[PDB]
Amino acid sequence: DTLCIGYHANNSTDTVDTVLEKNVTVTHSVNLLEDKHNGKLCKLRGVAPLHLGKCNIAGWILGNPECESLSTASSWSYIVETSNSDNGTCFPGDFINYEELREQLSSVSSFERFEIFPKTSSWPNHDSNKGVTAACPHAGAKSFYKNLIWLVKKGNSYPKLNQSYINDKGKEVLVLWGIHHPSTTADQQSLYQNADAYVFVGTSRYSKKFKPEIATRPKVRDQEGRMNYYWTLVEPGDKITFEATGNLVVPRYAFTMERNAGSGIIISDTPVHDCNTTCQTPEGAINTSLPFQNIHPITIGKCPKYVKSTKLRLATGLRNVPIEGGWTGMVDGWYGYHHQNEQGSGYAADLKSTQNAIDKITNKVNSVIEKMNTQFTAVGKEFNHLEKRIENLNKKVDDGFLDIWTYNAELLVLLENERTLDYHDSNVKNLYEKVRNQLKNNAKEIGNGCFEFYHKCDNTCMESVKNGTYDYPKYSEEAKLNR
Amino acid sequence: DTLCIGYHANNSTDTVDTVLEKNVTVTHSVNLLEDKHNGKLCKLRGVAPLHLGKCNIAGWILGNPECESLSTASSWSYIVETSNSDNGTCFPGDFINYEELREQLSSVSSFERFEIFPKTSSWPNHDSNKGVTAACPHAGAKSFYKNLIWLVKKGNSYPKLNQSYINDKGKEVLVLWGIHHPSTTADQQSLYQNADAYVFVGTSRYSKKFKPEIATRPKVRDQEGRMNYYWTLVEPGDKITFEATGNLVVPRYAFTMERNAGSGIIISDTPVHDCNTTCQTPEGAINTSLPFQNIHPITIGKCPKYVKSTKLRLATGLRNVPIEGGWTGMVDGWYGYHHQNEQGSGYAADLKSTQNAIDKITNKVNSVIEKMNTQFTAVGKEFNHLEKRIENLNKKVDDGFLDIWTYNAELLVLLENERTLDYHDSNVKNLYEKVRNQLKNNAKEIGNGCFEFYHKCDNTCMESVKNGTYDYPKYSEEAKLNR
Amino acid sequence: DTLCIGYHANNSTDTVDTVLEKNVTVTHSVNLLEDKHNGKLCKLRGVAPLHLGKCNIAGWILGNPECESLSTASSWSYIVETSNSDNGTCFPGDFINYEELREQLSSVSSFERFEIFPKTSSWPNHDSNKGVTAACPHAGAKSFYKNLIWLVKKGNSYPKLNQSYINDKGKEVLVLWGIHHPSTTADQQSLYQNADAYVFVGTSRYSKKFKPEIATRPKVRDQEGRMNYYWTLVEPGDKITFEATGNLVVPRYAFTMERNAGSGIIISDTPVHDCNTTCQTPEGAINTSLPFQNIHPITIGKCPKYVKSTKLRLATGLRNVPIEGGWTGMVDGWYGYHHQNEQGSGYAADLKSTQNAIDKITNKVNSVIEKMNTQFTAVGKEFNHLEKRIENLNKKVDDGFLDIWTYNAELLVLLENERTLDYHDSNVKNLYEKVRNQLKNNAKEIGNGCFEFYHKCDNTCMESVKNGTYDYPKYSEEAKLNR
Numbered sequence A, B, C: 001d002t003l004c005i006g007y008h009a010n011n012s013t014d015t016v017d018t019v020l021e022k023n024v025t026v027t028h029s030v031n032l033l034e035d036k037h038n039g040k041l042c043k044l045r046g047v048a049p050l051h052l053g054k055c056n057i058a059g060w061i062l063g064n065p066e067c068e069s070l071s072t073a074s075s076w077s078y079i080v081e082t083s084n085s086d087n088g089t090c091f092p093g094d095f096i097n098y099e100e101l102r103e104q105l106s107s108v109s110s111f112e113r114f115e116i117f118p119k120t121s122s123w124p125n126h127d128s129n130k131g132v133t134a135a136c137p138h139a140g141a142k143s144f145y146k147n148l149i150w151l152v153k154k155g156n157s158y159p160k161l162n163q164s165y166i167n168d169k170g171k172e173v174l175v176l177w178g179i180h181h182p183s184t185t186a187d188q189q190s191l192y193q194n195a196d197a198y199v200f201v202g203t204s205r206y207s208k209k210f211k212p213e214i215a216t217r218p219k220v221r222d223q224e225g226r227m228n229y230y231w232t233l234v235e236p237g238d239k240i241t242f243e244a245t246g247n248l249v250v251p252r253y254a255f256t257m258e259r260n261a262g263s264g265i266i267i268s269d270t271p272v273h274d275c276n277t278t279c280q281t282p283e284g285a286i287n288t289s290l291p292f293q294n295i296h297p298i299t300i301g302k303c304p305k306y307v308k309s310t311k312l313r314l315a316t317g318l319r320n321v322p323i324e325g326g327w328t329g330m331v332d333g334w335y336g337y338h339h340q341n342e343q344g345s346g347y348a349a350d351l352k353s354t355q356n357a358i359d360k361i362t363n364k365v366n367s368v369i370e371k372m373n374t375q376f377t378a379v380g381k382e383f384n385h386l387e388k389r390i391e392n393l394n395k396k397v398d399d400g401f402l403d404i405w406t407y408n409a410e411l412l413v414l415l416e417n418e419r420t421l422d423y424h425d426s427n428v429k430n431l432y433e434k435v436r437n438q439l440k441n442n443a444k445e446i447g448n449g450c451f452e453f454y455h456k457c458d459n460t461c462m463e464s465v466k467n468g469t470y471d472y473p474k475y476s477e478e479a480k481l482n483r
Ligand SMILES: *[C@@H]1O[C@H](CO)[C@@H](O[C@@H]2O[C@H](CO)[C@@H](O)[C@H](O)[C@H]2NC(C)=O)[C@H](O)[C@H]1NC(C)=O
Pocket: A064, A065, A066, A086, A087, A088, A089, A090, A135, A136, A137, A221
């Protein structure tokens, strides 16, 4: 009659690496690294993105003629631009603090367009119907930005323009305007009469005077002149004043909006779908609770940390090795016993030891995952061609964090997997000793983690040994007789 | 007669977490996380902060009428502003490179105010007594900044102003001035006569021409005009030249100062007290050598790393479990023996093993703490409303470091605590074996980590076993007789 | 007859630290920290640096008279400036976006100088031979920048200047020019006639008007006036237009170049040598595959992480302690046996166990090193005196990463070294047990990890025990007789 202590085995072919040994096949493991996405752009915090299918942000906020088709949302959690979103400014010039605006508009709680300076009543002394150009065509017709009015001299006169808006909203108002810069003096006079024109704009924390910069420039979109764009936020209760003798492109519409924390802009040709996520990647939303991902470095949301590793498999089970080896027949648990006597034979798991190991290892896996506790962040940032130093500083931060997370994540798995297997080996060894301590002189050790009895051990005996209730004295005399 | 190997126990109710098991009660532990402060703002490097109780930095450096009460320090290690420090610029306008100045003044080795352009001798052709406004009242009277002079036309004439200062100090000089921008032409003429006025200021590495920007603006502090503020540092040996035909607010006082490395600004209503610290937090100074703190993300000094964890308890002792369990009576050490014979009974610690474990664990704790080796840094940074991209870059850095430190700190405690307990278990087991190896056949194992002798073992025997000097052969014959 | 299980020892005197115990002497260890360099500046990616021995970048790109001796490379991987590279701008003024230019030129795939506006044909109406100054002397003669032409009125007339360049290159063109600012009106007229002069420059994404700012300034290099420098890149297919009535210093030469990713600038007096490296440090190139270095925080290339630790020794071997202690005579392996009988005595390594431990530990060391997987980065960044906030942000990033890497690197070695020694102890103990399991009752344990036989064990017996093929029953009767 024999009783053996062994461990579980199966047909599992996946592996883990350990710091000491590579390609260790295990019976069970979990994945800490998410390498998949659903291929769709989803809502964040239950709120849809603003999708600019053809237009970029400058185009959309200014009212490029091609953005008219776009339905504006009252709110959004992030902005999506496509790889071919070319419809930005249609009248060539510099959009000032464009990048800062792009970021401020990245996430809004609310957004309403309203007509700040009504076309039919605000500009009675100026011609608001000649403000068109071939650079901003609509269905082949000369046109202009929808949210701006380009005023032209009326009756060969451009009287001082003096208008203001008082922000009676409970929210900040975004006001945009522009300055026109004719290619020649002749154009300056044709449009504004005054020649030596100036523009002044200001609010309680903003004040700037502008002058026309008249020179011939290389043609862009068939324009030898330029039009710059400016913007400011007006605090609730404040006033914005526009004073000009020419070259001012006045706001028509302005936006009442409340900035929501902050998010980012995703550039992707990936479609928007009615789905929910907590982590939005340019390649598609990520749906996981795992601490790491290797899909993309730039994500918006409470995202897993980006690592450049390809495989972070955390062992939970023991080595799968078909004690000489494991028992593929012991399907009911990790550790257990096999017995053979004159009544019968077979396998049975040691439920106390097995469940103990399961609870401790499961909690261990949960510790690694639960402690990541990520924060909601935009990650991606945008800089212009004269901001390379800061762009590269941002890169240092992303590369530094990547190397830290990759190094620590890859080692952590390697530090954990080695012991996990030693832990299981220890538990198996401990079962062997627990039996040895009971059998004492009533059985001999025969190798392979097995004991051979010096007495007949029936089913009620094998159970006594497994349950830790074996009566040594009871079988002592028989054992003496057989030695 | 018996001899048992056991371990210490007490009435301690605190716990540690391990990566495998939560809420493990231990006999001894240490705290790696500082969650308290003394509630006071203290000196850094033995040097007091500059406390601006009512004024902010712009107010203080310009000489806002309400800062007159403030006693200026000759030096400071950091600057403290209160939550209601509203007295900044009193004459509305833009303070240029204000944020850069705020940071440069954050820490100074020395700071002296001196009268760079004496009021009674530097401006003989201009009226220095009319430079007042209702926007900067003093005790109800019209007044102005104390460190600046606003010059007005004298006798309906504003002759070219031409003054310079040569820096004969061994330290850099901070010179501040401003440009006035009247709301109307009529005011420009009332104050400066010339109408088409200009201002020029320059040093060896600085040169800028300014022109009045005259337009009506929204009233701020009852002013329809604005006054901008500018500043520059003058290197030792250099000269600063002020040339103007109007609209120049000239320096009266300038500051000779030496910038000390760099620190930061704390915004807090917490009072300044005569105390010392090496880490200043907005909520109160931190007094600890521990590697982590969870008090606040923004601190100045050689501060513990901020983590968002709440509990980093590092086990030093063994499991406190009242071998079946621990011995609450073994008060003299972690590991030890209990004996009982016909002479007496009781507990005694194994001093060699216990001290060994103490030295190794104590050194281990010190390793975790000592290796943090922090640096002196300001941490907090300030950006304006047109600098959101860089402000958010700074945020990424702080959030990234927080997640890294929190994740690693929480795991480190969990990686350490699990083994610390296994280490103690190993030492206890080793004592059991050391005894087993001596007693051999002269005693039997009876469970609970205890041996039962087959011979009479007197006090001089029990000591021989504990001391590793047990004479097996000596008691062999008696043991044979009793088997 | 005896057989002992022991371990290797030698005369090695180096140590490792462990988290539990300091100064542990080991038989073998490796260094993870590189603290040496070859003292020379080497090529990166097979490409030489651009070495500016006397000139700085502004000097070199503008053509300071002292840079004429310098041979320009067609390409470079990084730029080297010396500690005394004072020859920058020779005509005092502000070089605009200088820092951004310095970084863009840090690494170029190709770089060709060409004469964008030929001196003899582009400026027929202006005097190109009077553009000299005492501020930019050459061999004692008045001179000027080599890549720029300072045009002066010809025949007391300065007719409108109108020239343009079309970029017919497949690469970006860097065009530099400057604006002159005379100290007095009299000089403005002496040089340009027009007095109220202006300069306009523009490209498809750039447009700026400049005006002379005429005022007397402190003398720098005997100049009471100033000359500012501007630059822009012209995209392939675009045009740059220069329109002026005076005060324009026109480009003579321009550079056709392609920016290569990005690198940095090293300031060092260390010479350039014909050698190769993958990591360039200001103190000399680093030649190692190790994960960490403590040479310098600022490096260019696929560099080891900078740590401020001094010693990262990773144990590979076992404790070197001349089982009571190690065997200095067992030179053929880490673990092994010693035997003595009537035939002979001596040592022999256990090759199976020793090689197993070597392969696992060697792979372990390689795991720590191989997983660092660094990226190519410049690390160093440059900011001006009005950019302290961003400079200090960059510092936070470097200090934060340093503390993270130092803390983790120092602990990692301490976490690893402790167990490495326990691992070896476990393997030695396991050999002891493997022997014990065979000998059973045919030998006694005598301490020191040794067994003493109860029978005569010849050379063919000692080999049977070591090889795991000992026949217990064979010697059982003799063992009985001797007990
Ligand atoms: C909107 O974007 C399209 C491009 O997506 C612009 O059309 C291009 O205009 C340039 C200049 O006339 C032509 O050289 C290209 O061949 C046109 N491309 C296509 C596909 O038609 C269009 O002009 C933009 N409209 C506005 C108002 O900005």
